[PDB]
Amino acid sequence: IEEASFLNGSDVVILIDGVEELYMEEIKADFEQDEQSIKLLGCQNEISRVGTTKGSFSLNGYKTDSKFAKLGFRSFEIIYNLSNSETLGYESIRLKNCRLKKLPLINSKAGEIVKIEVEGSFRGYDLLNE
Amino acid sequence: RLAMPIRANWGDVGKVVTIKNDGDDMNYSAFKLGKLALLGNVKELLLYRLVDGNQKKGTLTLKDTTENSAKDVIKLETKYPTARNFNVTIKSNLVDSDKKDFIFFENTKQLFSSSIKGTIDEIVLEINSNLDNEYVIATKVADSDTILANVVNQALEGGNDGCTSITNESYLKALEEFERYSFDSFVLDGVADEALQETTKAWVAKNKELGKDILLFLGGKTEDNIKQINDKSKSFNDENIVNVGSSAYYENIKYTPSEVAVYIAALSVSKGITGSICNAKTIFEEVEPRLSQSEVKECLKSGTLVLDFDDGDVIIVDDVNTFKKYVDDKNEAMGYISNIMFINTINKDTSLKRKEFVGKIFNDATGQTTVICALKKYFEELMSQGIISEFNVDIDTELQATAKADEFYWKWDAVKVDVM
Numbered sequence: 001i002e003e004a005s006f007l008n009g010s011d012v013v014i015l016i017d018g019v020e021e022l023y024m025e026e027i028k029a030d031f032e033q034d035e036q037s038i039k040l041l042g043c044q045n046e047i048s049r050v051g052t053t054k055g056s057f058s059l060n061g062y063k064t065d066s067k068f069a070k071l072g073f074r075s076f077e078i079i080y081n082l083s084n085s086e087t088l089g090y091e092s093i094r095l096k097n098c099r100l101k102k103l104p105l106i107n108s109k110a111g112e113i114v115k116i117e118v119e120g121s122f123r124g125y126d127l128l129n130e
Numbered sequence: 131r132l133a134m135p136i137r138a139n140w141g142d143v144g145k146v147v148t149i150k151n152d153g154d155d156m157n158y159s160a161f162k163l164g165k166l167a168l169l170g171n172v173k174e175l176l177l178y179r180l181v182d183g184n185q186k187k188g189t190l191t192l193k194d195t196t197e198n199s200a201k202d203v204i205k206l207e208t209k210y211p212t213a214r215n216f217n218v219t220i221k222s223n224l225v226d227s228d229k230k231d232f233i234f235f236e237n238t239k240q241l242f243s244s245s246i247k248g249t250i251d252e253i254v255l256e257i258n259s260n261l262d263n264e265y266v267i268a269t270k271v272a273d274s275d276t277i278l279a280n281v282v283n284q285a286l287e288g289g290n291d292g293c294t295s296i297t298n299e300s301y302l303k304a305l306e307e308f309e310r311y312s313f314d315s316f317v318l319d320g321v322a323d324e325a326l327q328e329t330t331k332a333w334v335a336k337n338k339e340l341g342k343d344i345l346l347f348l349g350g351k352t353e354d355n356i357k358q359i360n361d362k363s364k365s366f367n368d369e370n371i372v373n374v375g376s377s378a379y380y381e382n383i384k385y386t387p388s389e390v391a392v393y394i395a396a397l398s399v400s401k402g403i404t405g406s407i408c409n410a411k412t413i414f415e416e417v418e419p420r421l422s423q424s425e426v427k428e429c430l431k432s433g434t435l436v437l438d439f440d441d442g443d444v445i446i447v448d449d450v451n452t453f454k455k456y457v458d459d460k461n462e463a464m465g466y467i468s469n470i471m472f473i474n475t476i477n478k479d480t481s482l483k484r485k486e487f488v489g490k491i492f493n494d495a496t497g498q499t500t501v502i503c504a505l506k507k508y509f510e511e512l513m514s515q516g517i518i519s520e521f522n523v524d525i526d527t528e529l530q531a532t533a534k535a536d537e538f539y540w541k542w543d544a545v546k547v548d549v550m
Binding site: 015018019020077079081092094128 | 487490491492496497499500503
C-alpha cells in the first residue's frame with residue numbers, strides 16, 4: 001500500500017518583511033477577482049471573465065512585541081514556506097506590497113493569553129517554489 | 131556642491147566654507163576662478179584656500195593719548211591671514227575730541243568710515259560688526275575709556291600673500307581637509323602639473339575603494355597641443371576623472387584647460403543626473419585649439435572632454451571621461467560622466483539598502499531573495515520615473531560561490547536613455 005502525505009500546518013515558516021516571524025499561528029491569503037458576469041443577448045449561459053484582481057490576507061499569533069503597531073500602514077512583503085519533510089518538496093509563496101487593513105493596537109482579555117490578529121491586502125503574489 | 135581649492139589671498143586657510151548665491155583681485159582664484167565655479171550655477175559653492183606655509187596674519191597695534199604715557203588698548207588684524215596693505219587711518223573727530231574717526235582702506239580706496247566714543251568695547255564691536263568691515267577683524271587689548279592717537283593709512287603687515295607658493299604639499303592640504311567632507315565634484319584650481327594630477331588620481335582612487343566617488347575634473351597645461359592633451363588623457367583611465375582639453379576665454383584670461391575645468395565641473399554638478407552636457411551650450415566666448423571631425427574624434431577617443439567653438443557659441447562636443455579609452459567588458463555608455471555620476475548615486479542608494487538589511491536577516495536563499503527583490507523594486511521605481519529603460523539585478527554568482535557566511539554579493543546592470 002503506497003505512501004501518502006499530509007502537509008502538517010506546523011511546518012509553516014513565515015518571514016514578514018524579511019525577518020523571520022516565529023510566533024505566528026495561522027495565516028490565510030487569497031487572490032480575489034471580480035467575476036464580471038455578462039448576459040449575452042442570444043445565449044442563455046452567463047459568461048465570466050477575469051475582471052480585476054484583489055489580494056487579501058490575515059495572520060493570527062501570540063503577541064510578543066509592538067512590531068505591527070509600530071509598522072503602521074507601511075507596505076511590506078510576506079514569505080510563506082510550507083515546508084514538507086516526508087517529501088522534501090517545500091512550497092514558498094511571496095505576497096507583494098502587503099498593507100494592513102486595520103492596525104491592531106490593543107487586544108487582550110484578563111484571563112487569557114494575548115494574541116494579535118491582522119488582516120489586510122496585497123497588490124500581487126509570486127509563487128517562488130512548489 | 132563643488133570643492134573649490136582657490137589659489138587666493140582671500141578666504142580662510144585650512145578650513146571649508148560655503149557661499150550662497152551672493153576675493154576680488156584677478157590674481158586670486160576667489161574671483162578669477164570663483165566666477166567660473168559660480169557661472170555653472172551649482173546650488174552653492176564650497177571653497178578652500180591654498181597658501182605657502184611661510185604665511186601668517188598682519189597685525190596693527192594702536193595706543194591711547196588721553197594720558198601722557200601711551201598704552202595699547204586696540205589691536206587690529208586682517209580677517210584672513212595676509213600681507214595685503216589693508217591700510218587704516220585713525221584721526222581725532224572734528225567736533226568731539228572723545229570720538230575717533232575710523233577710515234579703512236583696501237589698498238587706498240575708502241572702504242568703511244565711522245566714529246565711536248572712546249570706550250573700547252563699542253569701537254571694537256562696531257569695527258567687527260559693521261557691513262563694510264568684511265576685510266578686517268578688530269580685537270580689544272584691555273578695558274579702557276581712553277582716546278587713540280592720530281595715525282594715517284596704517285598698513286597691517288606680518289603675514290604673506292596667499293599665492294606665495296603653490297606646491298605639492300600645499301595643494302595636498304586641500305585634499306587632506308576635503309577627506310572629511312563629501313561633494314558632488316572636486317576640481318584642480320588650474321595648476322596643470324602632472325604630479326598634482328597623479329596625486330589627486332591616487333587620492334580619488336583611495337576614496338573609490340572607500341566609495342566616495344567624488345567626480346574629479348582636471349585639464350592640460352597651456353603648452354599642450356592636441357597631441358600632448360591626448361597623451362595626458364590616455365595617461366589616466368579612471369571613470370570619475372576628466373581632462374579638459376582646450377583653453378578658453380570668458381572675459382580677459384586665457385583660462386587653462388585645468389582652469390576651465392572649474393566651470394565645467396560646476397556645469398556638470400548643476401546638471402545632475404537628468405542633465406547631460408554632451409551638446410550643451412557653455413558660457414565661454416571662445417576655446418582653443420580648434421578641432422575638426424578628425425581632431426574631435428582623436429581627442430574624445432584618447433579620453434579628452436572636447437570643447438570647440440564649432441558654432442556661434444562654445445559647445446561641449448561630448449561629456450566624456452578618462453575611461454573613454456574603455457575596455458571590452460564595459461560598453462562605451464560607461465564612458466560618460468553623467469552616467470558615472472548616475473552609477474555613483476545608485477551605489478549610494480544601494481548602500482542605504484545595505485544598512486537597511488544588516489545581519490538581522492539570515493544568510494540563506496530567503497534573505498538573498500528578499501534583498502534582491504528590494505533592489506528589483508528600487509529599479510522598477512526608477513524605471514517608472516523613467517531614468518532606467520531596462521535592468522537585471524541578480525546574485526553575483528562569481529563572488530557568491532566562494533562567499534563566507536557573513537558576506538553576500540550582488541550586481542546590477544541597466545540601460546539608460548540616450549541623447550544625441
